Amino acid sequence: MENVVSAPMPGKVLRVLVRVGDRVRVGQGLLVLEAMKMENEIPSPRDGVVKRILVKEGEIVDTGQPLIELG
């Protein structure tokens, strides 16, 4: 049971697609992570509510780094 969206690889947080409190669906893109001339939509692992967004747009993140917590 997944509660935290973490970075699958290092990247730059290009865009955060949802806000705290928003309802989300499994497989929905929640943010866009840029890496190696590619824009990766990072999905919600489950239906739920966005509780916390732990990064800002522009931020560089490393592998496994927490990005979003679901409530």
Author numbering: 79 to 149
The study reports:
We previously determined the crystal structure of the C-terminal 73-residue fragment of PhBCCP (PhBCCPΔN76) that represents the biotinyl(/lipoyl attachment) domain of the hypothetical methylmalonyl-CoA decarboxylase γ chain. This domain adopts a flattened β-barrel comprising two homologous ‘hammerhead’ structures that confer an intramolecular pseudo-twofold symmetry reflecting the gene duplication. Moderate deviations of up to 2.53 Å were observed at residues 114–116, which constitute a flexible β-turn harbouring the Lys115 residue to be biotinylated.
In the PhBCCP system (PhBCCPΔN79) residue 138 was selected as the target residue for the mutation experiment because it is a solvent-exposed and nonconserved residue on a surface β-sheet. Moreover, in modelling it could be replaced by any other residue except for proline without intramolecular steric hindrance. The isoleucine mutant (A138I) and the tyrosine mutant (A138Y) conferring residue 138 with the highest crystal-packing propensities for β-sheet provided better crystallization scores when compared with other constructs, including the wild type. The A138I mutant and the A138Y mutant produced another orthorhombic crystal form belonging to space group C2221 and a trigonal crystal form belonging to space group P3121, respectively. The crystal structures of the A138I and A138Y mutants were determined at resolutions of 1.9 and 1.5 Å, respectively. In these mutant crystals the crystal-packing interface involving residue 138 differs completely from those of the other two crystal forms. Neither the C orthorhombic nor the trigonal crystals could be obtained with the wild-type protein. Therefore, it is conceivable that the substitution of Ala by Ile/Tyr with a better crystal-packing propensity created novel packing interfaces.
